[PDB]
């Protein structure tokens, strides 16, 4: 794997010795080049994995997430190029350094053949994010948001460390291959119940599960644009990836320990979808949409059937790309408007037609329109849950209808209607924003042609 | 015909020729417990390094 990790590390000296007016160009070019290198990992085989060495291994679950992580960084740089114009060279270089460190930690996390190394990098991914949120944030609530994001995650993930070291003491190894091959059933006991809770809660808090999602709207609203996309696209998938990796040792306890979380997610999807309808903010609406989709992913993972896992992976990738696009569009609107309110600027389609087209495409993809991978993952999870129980279809259909409703409400309120009269600084959209939207959307419509690349190991 | 001992004579250490057998164990001590194995050998490099979590060296 080192052919990927080493260039990401070399991105730091490359950035720090660049000229004052050429950091963005170099960072973007070499990030894109790195993404091309990461494409080779996608060719997985039906057998075990691509066991590179004793420390790193790649599966067909890690490959799509790794490619998405490597692809996101150029988009983050193009998004951050706007509001960092009046920033000193040292602070811009520090921002790029934080982004590069985040990418490096995520890359090392997603392979992480050993569970303790996975946990170490999984918590290491928390420092650059907190620095980005609390330093380059506009509102005065970024401090409280950073505190919430830190503590909600750390409180859940601290018992996970104890559970992992206990498992190593009893089992004798935490390597995922040995863990998978030597797995033994968990007896129904209070100690095993608490081991299950410790191993699960750390990933359920980050997903997030309904009832522990309070940190997500704050972190997404107060963060800068790049922090928002990296939170919505990749950082939410860490919990689901960890849960799908670690549910291999919790059987057969899960068969009855999944009921509270299944009920919480299947009701919180409806609750957050309804919340999206009555929202005065755009970024908050998108954050709640992300919560709903991640609740569906939680249900899929807890069902634990092959179709559930395939749909979960597809929905992970699709939601990451869609949420990143939606946050990009909201940021472009906010930069001209400087208000971040849904009804303050209206009828923008008459003034910016191409951005209206991008809004329509993003809303349609979020609406789970066929044959996009959004609906592929959605439908796989729906069929798996229907096999689990015939009554889930009611909740899932209600969620689908409310999702369509709030997506088209978001489109209509900001694009259709009569323009607001007292706003006269809606300049024509730059080439940077159009290119950003195109690079967000084209991979989705391209992946809809080859779904097997994002359907996970149980394909 | 007795000669008084001079200075430094009565404080001399002397030898006694006696037929009383030398006591073999005057302290009435028990048997000393067996010592530790104190094994020996040639050192070899640690098997698979430190074996501390994910460290391969
Ligand atoms: C129907 C098939 C057609 C095939 C022909 C080839 C077309 C290739 C298009 C590829 C994707 C387009 C790229 C997205 C951004 C567009 C760029 C842009 O800005 O446009 C400005 C440009 C110039 O206009 P302008 O005046 O300068 O700009 C003024 C404003 O923009 C004002 O703009 P506007 O008012 O003109 O509107 C823009 C327009 C264009 O914007 C879009 O919305 C395009 C995106 C639509 C997809 C929505 C997401 C749902 C997921 C679908 C994923 C399928 C992808 C398949 C692989 C794609 C490969 C990249 O939006 C629409 O017209 C509404 C689209 C809603 C269609 C709903 C039906 C979807 C499912 C249909 C079946 C698909 C699978 C078929 C399977 C069975 C048959 C074999 O206009 C165009 O280029 C229009 C392109 C044609 C529209 C294509 C819509 C359907 C095709 C989807 C993919 C084709 C499937 C393959 C089948 C082949 C047989
Ligand atoms: C240079 C001039 C001299 C020269 O050419 O000597 C060549 C020399 C030839 O040595 P070799 O014995 O023939 O290579 C054997 C194989 O490489 C593989 O040999 P191995 O597998 O038997 O030994 C690797 C093993 C034992 O090695 C170690 O214990 C050392 C751990 C890292 C080594 C870093 C070396 C260079 C550091 C550059 C700055 C990085 C930032 O490492 C581990 O057990 C896994 C530990 C992974 C990270 C530790 C956990 C902390 C996570 C967060 C880290 C953040 C730190 C604070 C911020 O290789 C190097 O010195 C190049 C770097 C070594 C990388 C191998 C370790 C792979 C696992 C971690 C990769 C991290 C890469 C970071 C970017 C590095 C940019 C350069
Ligand atoms: C008509 C043709 C149509 C199809 C064209 C397809 C072209 C594909 C090009 C894109 C390739 C994607 C990158 C793939 C990287 C993964 C593979 C890579 O890691 O392999 C390395 C090798 O990589 C190549 O040497 C270098 C390729 C890098 C460049 C790819 C071509 C495009 C580069 C564009 C860069 C910018 C161009 C100039 C712009 C100004 C190391 O290989 P190694 O592990 O040892 O192999 C061991 C097995 N052996 C012994 C049999 C070999
Ligand atoms: C708030 C936002 C979400 C946060 C996370 C929510 C998820 C946490 C909920 C925990 C999941 C279930 C916990 C225990 C499940 C075991 C089943 C048990 O509850 O049912 C009965 C257990 O009886 C009673 O429940 C005993 C436990 C009563 C005390 C527990 C507290 C109950 C209310 C507290 C709720 C607080 C939750 C949040 C804390 C901050 C069955 O009796 P029995 O068959 O004999 O024993 C089965 C176990 N055996 C087989 C190993 C022996
Ligand atoms: C966003 C906030 C979320 C907070 C999450 C916190 C709750 C996480 C679940 C409990 C965490 C502690 C579990 C302990 C770690 C697992 C270790 C383990 O499994 O070892 C058990 C030990 O089990 C325990 O010791 C558990 C004791 C728990 C003490 C701490 C209680 C913390 C709160 C409990 C209730 C929380 C549960 C619901 C939380 C919902 C989220 C708020 C086996 O014991 P042995 O010694 O091997 O016995 C074998 C011989 N018969």
UniProtKB/TrEMBL annotation, chain A:
Membrane-traversing stretches: 21-41, 61-80, 92-110, 116-133, 145-167, 193-216, 223-244, 256-277, 284-303, 309-330, 351-369, 389-412, 433-449
InterPro entries (UniProt xref): NADH4_N, NADH_Q_OxRdtase_chainM/4, NADH_UbQ_OxRdtase, ND/Mrp_TM
Catalytic activity entry: a ubiquinone + NADH + 5 H(+)(in) = a ubiquinol + NAD(+) + 4 H(+)(out)
Electron transport recorded as keyword: yes
Pfam families, sorted: Oxidored_q5_N, Proton_antipo_M
Subcellular location(s) per record: Mitochondrion membrane
Signal peptide limits: none
Enzyme class: translocase
Gene: NADH4
PANTHER family: NADH-UBIQUINONE OXIDOREDUCTASE CHAIN 4
Main localization of the protein described in the UniProt heading: mitochondrion
E.C. number: 7.1.1.2
Topology relative to the membrane: Multi-pass membrane protein
GO terms, biological process: ATP synthesis coupled electron transport
Listed name of the protein: NADH-ubiquinone oxidoreductase chain 4
A GO molecular-function annotation: NADH dehydrogenase (ubiquinone) activity
Limits of the NADH:quinone oxidoreductase/Mrp antiporter transmembrane domain: 112-401
TrEMBL record, chain B:
Region annotation Disordered: where it falls in the sequence: 18-49
Ranges annotated as biased composition (Basic and acidic residues): 31-45
Subcellular location: Mitochondrion intermembrane space
Top-level taxonomic group: Eukaryota
Family: Belongs to the complex I NDUFA8 subunit family.
Subunit structure: Complex I is composed of 45 different subunits.
Described function: Accessory subunit of the mitochondrial membrane respiratory chain NADH dehydrogenase (Complex I), that is believed not to be involved in catalysis. Complex I functions in the transfer of electrons from NADH to the respiratory chain. The immediate electron acceptor for the enzyme is believed to be ubiquinone.
Identification of the protein by name: NADH dehydrogenase [ubiquinone] 1 alpha subcomplex subunit 8
Organism: Sus scrofa
Full-sequence range covered: 193 to 249 of 249
